[PDB]
Enzyme design. Structure first.
Site, PDB file in Angstrom:
ATOM      1  N   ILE A 173      -6.030   0.996  11.276  1.00  0.00           N
ATOM      2  CA  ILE A 173      -7.095   2.084  11.610  1.00  0.00           C
ATOM      3  C   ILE A 173      -8.283   1.321  10.923  1.00  0.00           C
ATOM      4  O   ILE A 173      -8.149   0.423  10.173  1.00  0.00           O
ATOM      5  CB  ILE A 173      -6.663   3.070  11.083  1.00  0.00           C
TER       6      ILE A 173
ATOM      7  N   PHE B  24      -5.867   6.769  -0.325  1.00  0.00           N
ATOM      8  CA  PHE B  24      -5.035   5.391  -0.487  1.00  0.00           C
ATOM      9  C   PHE B  24      -4.606   5.083  -1.907  1.00  0.00           C
ATOM     10  O   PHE B  24      -5.010   5.400  -3.013  1.00  0.00           O
ATOM     11  CB  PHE B  24      -5.530   4.269   0.432  1.00  0.00           C
TER      12      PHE B  24
ATOM     13  N   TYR C  89      -7.552   8.791  12.584  1.00  0.00           N
ATOM     14  CA  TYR C  89      -6.960   9.671  13.583  1.00  0.00           C
ATOM     15  C   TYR C  89      -7.720  10.876  13.758  1.00  0.00           C
ATOM     16  O   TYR C  89      -8.352  11.233  14.542  1.00  0.00           O
ATOM     17  CB  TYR C  89      -5.632  10.035  13.435  1.00  0.00           C
TER      18      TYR C  89
ATOM     19  N   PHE D  37       2.618  11.191   2.878  1.00  0.00           N
ATOM     20  CA  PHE D  37       2.890  10.820   4.285  1.00  0.00           C
ATOM     21  C   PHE D  37       3.468   9.301   4.574  1.00  0.00           C
ATOM     22  O   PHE D  37       4.082   9.272   5.609  1.00  0.00           O
ATOM     23  CB  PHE D  37       1.683  11.203   5.130  1.00  0.00           C
ATOM     24  N   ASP D  38       3.275   8.435   3.972  1.00  0.00           N
ATOM     25  CA  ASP D  38       3.585   7.188   4.061  1.00  0.00           C
ATOM     26  C   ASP D  38       3.287   6.462   2.626  1.00  0.00           C
ATOM     27  O   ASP D  38       2.745   6.814   1.859  1.00  0.00           O
ATOM     28  CB  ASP D  38       2.564   6.344   5.001  1.00  0.00           C
TER      29      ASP D  38
ATOM     30  N   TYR E 209       0.868  -1.120   0.040  1.00  0.00           N
ATOM     31  CA  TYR E 209       0.068   0.017   0.148  1.00  0.00           C
ATOM     32  C   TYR E 209       0.671   1.050   0.009  1.00  0.00           C
ATOM     33  O   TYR E 209       1.975   0.971   0.282  1.00  0.00           O
ATOM     34  CB  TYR E 209      -0.850   0.137   1.114  1.00  0.00           C
TER      35      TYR E 209
END
Lengths: 107, 803, 412
Positions: A56, A99, A82, A36-37, A26
């Site tokens: 999450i 995503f 979050y 961010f990731d 992912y």
């Protein structure tokens, strides 16, 4: 709640079960488009388990929705993530995730 | 170039294509450019697309004024006052007004940054959807971008778009824009000087952070940019590998080749990184941002190391290592950032534990020889070697990310790349290649060697690459070359670590021989007693007398093994001293730390006894059975040494108390006061207690541990003795007297007395003078502590030591 | 000047105090770098002695009182006295920067008035002097690092977003970040909670594959048409996801700078590129992708053919997949110059030209490039305006340029 476009179909019907290894690649950038990731980028195929409550809720339910080999855009609600408190340093308060997730294998 | 013409230029590298320069030129004395280097030279050609640049004082004559409603005027007393565009600095997110005034033909809109039209007119967008045929499908787009035309006009906030004009409403408002950004944009056909004035708050509400935002203000950051024509821009260094056909046309490119970019977000526009070599303000600023990122995760904030791995994303750093044109400041910054994220925790842990040398007596630690008839990188050393563990920075999970260790990286790939870097750099930078990677040899060499040093510490490079790099440097070249100052100031630490690894090998060999020898002479003690007044005086007299009446038992087997060790004590030792003297004889030295490191290495060469002198009273051996508690206590004690240098320190004391309670509960701490005294850990805990005072629960937690350490052996009590005067001057009120009573600094001082008559006789008079100075009570309660300490000071043995 | 203005005004020195002030700034000047080491130590020892003479008289408190009573205006009196105001402020804060930089004792004596200086930090006129004083205090006093708390630091993070972008602010924040020998960890937790998360106050890095853009060498001004085909995709040459783009543009507008134009170069990014290709098959327009679906739901995978047509007498673009409707895209757009297919990608991908060799032709429009070979060229393909050209001998160069179907007879 959460609405997720299947970008590319996988096999369609193979949606996982609690007790099956969720081998995934992912990544994901923010609503603005900033990253961010990226588990793609460090070349670690990620693993987790739905039911064991590892990730999450939006990513968990999106992995519940998809199938094997299904690249899909898992845009999730910030308050499912979050959200208000945020991830303090990484995710700012009240930001919506975007995503790019494809399931790999199941055990 | 002009209209349709071709250039053909040769910046060196082209001696095979000198058409006339061997004819005249080289013979007279001229030169090409890039004779030495491997690099090209990038060229900053001119662009076409206009990007809105700032407003210098060096205009022809167009001059804005900064006036507080928050007005910005103009003046263009010139001849050519026709074609000047004016886009403004900071954008709108996707309520608050913004009025424009003209003194005497003028366009007003809201421009999104994708706009470069250099035309003087009104010039220039309707996308369609489907329900498989449509039927709504159309409310999408018109912006390309936005045009209206003493007037006072407002594009107010929210979301939608507003067009007003002097209280009246002009038609055709484009009130549909979901997620874009806009600029307050007014062009100019300046019919006269004094042409504009700009501005129930204002845009100061929208852009800046606070949004009560009732008083509006132009900040200093608000510029009033002028859309100038062009800037010089870089040259797209490697582009095309097209394979194609002409019957089938199999047009194909197979290129792994990536950019390296950023965007200034406040005036949003993507810019590649390695162009910035002339944008010196942005250079200095992004250098300082990297230096701050290096400052932030300094020494232990691993949670924040996960945060910076989310930001800067380590394979981006891997690409930042390779780029043979990135400037030296960015090079030093990213070379520091890879260290300060992924390496320095375990690195500084091993740097702290580089003087401990303890080793178990198992089977692997036994077959080690001496140097036979230059290779310190051998297969050896299970000598307690505090192991390395890592994390995996995903951003979906919990549990716990604040104690999680450090983020990962491609380890062996990284070390192979650094080997490639070192070899290729040594091959290049030898003939005065007049273009290094970062501009000079310092930015070339220095952080490469820093990364290689910190990687060499971390116990990677299995022995093949060690042999490769050693007889790369040795051949028996790197160090033999001519080098600047901080380069060899970096390399001295490499030489340090080489000699230190040699010391490690030496001590592990002597421990193996000591095991064999003690087995033999223990059996000799068995037979020498079994043959039959020299009984044991605490077993120190036995070994001391063995070496004393054996100062030349006295069997010839003993003498042979003695001669064996004294030929163990007997080619780097040559060349280190030779090259230190060689450097110091030629190159009169600044940066006195370099002088310090050089001559410390030089004396450390000529005093190979002395390292073995000051190393052996800090080593120790373990049976092999209880090694797991030793690993756990070394890990705990390393992280408490790292906790020493936090310093303040208000909430890591929970971790401190957890560590101390484990050190209590460890089994080896009970039976091995040699090891605990050898680590120097009592002085560690004591200096922590120093730092806490000049009043939380931390102090009594330390004093409890010192007191429990005072009660395991007599020589431990001698060790805890000598801190009396400082421990006494601490102990005025320091603990125990609301009702705490468990431990206190004075309780520690009394804990070091109670058993031994010798320490009772050892202590002296001004200490007791200070105690009775502290006996200056007026009421009260805490004098019971002073009297209790004196009671432990006077009697001690069933009869009072009368002095 | 609290109540009155006459005479005007009062025995009130301006050039006297400013002259004495520049003298005192020159008095405490640091010892130079190109001085001998013993002379350096002499000057430095006498300088620290001269500072310790001033600390035990509280002269800095007198300076603080002058700061208190000068910060009134925004630029009064007889207004030559109000004309030296910036210079007097600048010199006073430079003098305040002078009297601390060496001694640990003086920056320990500044335990008190630090928060008041952070209050005065938002004067938004003279950030230089207060900032430098604060930096030199925060370096040498580990006392005052124990003082400073959340609201101060939040103001200092806001201070850049007042005054643009100053590296000196980052020197300050690095000094707060690490002490002489140690750190303060909760302070750094506060830093990375309050500055980074949102990525707007400062820069941000990112890399992407080089984007290749090509064109079949022929300007085309008559309902136009073309056909291409994807052969091999393999979309993960690196961990960056790759892309395929199909569309129309002209060079009159959108100077095609690869990477240096709009974001990453790319396609569908300007006011001439009108791109196609997705999975969930929508497009880009101005580097903005809105979300047309269609009943195929397929990538541009290894066996895909795309119907590609341009519309006459309506500036309209609508493309299809194997003839099947993809909920037609563009209608009533801009017109200038001569257009061409600008089909682009950035990957290890091969494709083909079906322009004569054909597979597919429906009668929504008909004018293929094979039916416009006539003017000068044959069926050739080039690389989007190519301000470079690469070799190994010499990369040669190119001048800029000199760049319909209704011709012009002589009007007689």
């Amino acid at each position: 709640g959460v609405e997720i476009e299947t970008i590319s179909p996988g096999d369609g019907r193979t949606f996982p079960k609690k007790g099956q290894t969720c081998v995934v690649h992912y990544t994901g950038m923010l609503q603005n488009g900033k990253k961010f990731d990226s588990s793609r980028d460090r070349n670690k195929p990620f693993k987790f388990r739905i039911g064991k409550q590892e990730v999450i809720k939006g990513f968990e339910e999106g992995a519940a929705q998809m199938s094997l080999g299904q690249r899909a855009k898992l845009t999730c609600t910030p308050d499912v993530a979050y959200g208000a408190t945020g991830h303090p340093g990484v995710i700012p308060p009240n930001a919506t995730l975007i995503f790019d997730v494809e399931l790999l294998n199941l055990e | 170039l002009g209209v349709a013409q071709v250039g053909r230029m040769n910046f060196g590298k082209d001696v095979s294509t000198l058409k006339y320069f061997t004819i005249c030129g080289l013979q007279e004395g001229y030169e090409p450019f890039a004779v030495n280097t491997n690099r090209d030279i990038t060229m900053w050609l001119s662009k076409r697309l206009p990007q809105f640049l700032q407003v210098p004082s060096s205009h022809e004559h167009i001059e804005v004024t900064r006036i507080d409603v928050t007005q910005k005027s103009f003046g263009s007393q010139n001849s050519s006052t026709d074609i000047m565009f004016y886009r403004l600095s900071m954008p709108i997110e996707c309520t608050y007004y913004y009025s424009v005034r003209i003194f005497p033909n003028v366009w007003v809109g809201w421009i999104t940054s994708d706009f470069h039209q250099y035309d003087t007119a009104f010039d220039l967008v309707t996308v369609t959807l489907g329900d498989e045929k449509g039927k709504v499908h159309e409310s999408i787009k018109r912006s390309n971008y936005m045009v209206c035309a003493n007037g006072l006009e407002i594009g107010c906030v929210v979301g939608l778009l507003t067009f007003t004009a002097n209280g009246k409403d002009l038609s055709t408002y484009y009130q549909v824009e979901p997620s874009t950004k806009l600029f307050p944009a007014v062009f100019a056909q300046a019919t006269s000087p004094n042409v504009f004035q700009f501005e129930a708050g204002l845009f100061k509400s929208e852009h800046k952070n606070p949004v009560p935002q009732c008083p509006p203000r132009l900040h200093v950051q608000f510029l009033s940019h002028v859309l100038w024509s062009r800037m010089p821009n870089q040259f797209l260094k490697v582009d095309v590998s097209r394979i194609s056909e002409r019957q089938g046309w199999l047009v194909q490119c197979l290129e792994p080749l990536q950019f390296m970019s950023l965007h200034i977000p406040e005036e949003n526009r993507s810019v590649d990184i390695l162009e910035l070599t002339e944008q010196e303000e942005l250079l200095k600023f992004h250098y300082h941002t990297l230096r701050l990122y290096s400052a932030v995760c300094a020494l232990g904030n691993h949670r924040v190391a996960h945060a910076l791995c989310s930001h800067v994303d380590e394979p981006q750093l891997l690409y930042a290592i390779e780029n043979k044109y990135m400037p030296g400041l960015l090079r030093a910054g990213y070379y520091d950032l890879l260290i300060d994220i992924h390496l320095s925790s375990y690195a500084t842990a091993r740097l702290m534990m580089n003087n401990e040398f303890i080793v178990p007596m198992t089977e692997e630690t036994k077959s080690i020889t001496l140097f036979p008839d230059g290779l310190p990188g051998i297969g050896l050393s299970t000598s307690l070697r505090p192991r390395m563990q890592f994390s995996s920075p995903s951003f979906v999970s919990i549990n716990n990310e604040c104690y999680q260790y450090s983020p990962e990286f491609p380890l062996d790939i990284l070390k192979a790349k650094t080997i490639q870097m070192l070899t290729e750099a040594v091959q290049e930078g030898s003939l005065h290649a007049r273009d290094p990677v970062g501009g000079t040899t310092e930015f070339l060499f220095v952080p490469l060697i820093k990364l290689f040093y910190t990687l060499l510490i971390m116990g990677i490079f299995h022995n093949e690459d060690l042999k490769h790099i050693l007889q790369l440097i040795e051949p028996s070249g790197l160090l033999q070359m001519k080098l600047p100052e901080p380069v060899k100031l970096q390399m001295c630490l490499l030489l340090q670590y080489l000699c230190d690894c040699q010391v490690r090998h030496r001590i592990e060999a002597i421990v193996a021989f000591s095991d064999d020898f003690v087995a033999k002479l223990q059996d000799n003690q068995r037979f020498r007693y079994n043959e039959v007044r020299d009984q044991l005086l605490d077993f120190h007299e036995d070994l001391m007398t063995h070496c004393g009446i054996e100062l030349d038992s006295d069997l010839t087997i003993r003498g042979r093994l003695l001669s064996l060790v004294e030929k163990v004590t007997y080619t780097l030792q040559q060349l280190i001293s030779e090259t230190m003297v060689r450097w110091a004889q030629e190159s009169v030295i600044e940066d006195p730390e370099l002088v310090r490191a050089m001559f410390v290495l030089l004396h450390r060469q000529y005093d190979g006894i002395g390292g073995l002198v000051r190393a052996l009273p800090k080593t120790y051996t373990i049976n092999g059975v209880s090694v797991e508690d030793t690993i756990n206590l070394l890990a705990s004690l390393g992280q408490i040494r790292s906790l020493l240098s936090v310093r303040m320190g208000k909430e890591e004391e929970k971790l401190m108390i957890r560590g101390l309670g484990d050190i209590m509960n460890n089994k080896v701490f009970y039976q091995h006061p040699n090891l605990m005294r050898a680590l120097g850990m009592h002085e560690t805990v004591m200096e922590v207690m120093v730092n806490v005072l000049g009043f939380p629960k931390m102090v009594a937690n330390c004093c409890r541990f010192l007191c429990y350490f005072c009660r395991i052996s007599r020589q431990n009590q001698k060790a805890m003795f000598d801190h009396l005067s400082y421990l006494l001057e601490n102990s005025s009120v320091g603990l125990a007297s609301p009702a705490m009573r468990g431990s206190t600094p004075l309780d520690v001082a009394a804990a070091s007395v109670m058993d031994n008559n010798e320490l009772a006789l050892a202590l002296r008079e001004p200490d007791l003078e200070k105690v009775v100075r502290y006996l200056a009570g007026c009421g009260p309660v805490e004098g019971e502590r002073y009297l209790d300490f004196l009671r432990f000071a006077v009697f001690c043995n069933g009869e009072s030591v009368e002095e | 000047l609290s109540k009155k203005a006459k005479a005007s005004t009062v025995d009130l020195p301006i050039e006297s105090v400013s002259l004495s002030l520049q003298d005192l700034i020159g008095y405490f000047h640091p010892p130079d770098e190109h001085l001998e080491h013993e002379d350096k130590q002499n000057r430095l020892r006498a300088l620290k002695n001269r500072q310790n003479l001033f600390q035990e008289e509280g002269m800095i408190n007198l300076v603080l009182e002058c700061i208190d009573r000068l910060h009134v205006y925004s630029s009064v009196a007889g207004r030559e006295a109000g004309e030296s105001w910036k210079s007097i402020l600048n010199s006073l804060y430079e003098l305040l920067a002078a009297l601390i930089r060496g001694n640990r004792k003086n920056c320990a004596q500044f335990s008190g008035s630090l928060d008041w200086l952070i209050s005065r930090l938002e004067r938004l006129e003279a950030s230089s002097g207060i900032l430098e004083v604060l930096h030199c205090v925060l370096v040498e006093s580990p006392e005052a690092l124990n003082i400073i708390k959340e609201g101060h630091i939040k103001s200092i993070i806001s201070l850049l977003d007042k005054h643009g972008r100053n590296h000196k602010v980052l020197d300050v924040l690095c000094s707060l970040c690490v002490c002489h020998g140690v750190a303060v960890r909760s302070n750094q937790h506060l830093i990375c909670d309050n500055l980074l998360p949102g990525r707007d106050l400062l820069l941000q890095t990112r890399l992407v594959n080089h984007v290749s853009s090509m064109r079949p060498n022929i300007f085309l001004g008559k309902k136009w048409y073309y056909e291409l085909m994807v052969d091999h995709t393999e979309p993960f040459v690196t961990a960056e996801a790759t892309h395929l783009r199909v569309g129309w543009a002209s060079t009159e507008g959108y100077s095609p700078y690869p990477g240096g134009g709009e974001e990453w170069g790319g396609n569908g990014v300007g006011d001439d590129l009108f791109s196609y290709g997705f999975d969930g098959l929508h497009l880009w327009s101005g580097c903005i992708a809105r979300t047309v679906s269609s009943p195929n739901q397929h990538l541009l995978r290894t066996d895909d053919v795309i119907s590609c047509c341009l519309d006459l007498s309506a500036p309209s673009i609508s493309f299809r997949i194997n003839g099947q409707p993809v909920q037609g895209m563009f209608e009533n757009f801009n017109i200038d110059g001569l257009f061409f297919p600008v089909v682009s990608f950035s990957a290890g991908i091969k494709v083909r030209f079906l322009l004569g060799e054909f597979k597919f032709l429906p009668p929504p429009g008909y004018a293929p490039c094979y039916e416009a070979v006539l003017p000068k060229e044959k069926l050739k393909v080039e690389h989007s305006r190519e301000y470079k050209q690469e070799r190994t001998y010499t990369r040669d160069l190119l001048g800029p340029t000199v760049s319909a179907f209704t011709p012009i007879p002589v009007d007689t």
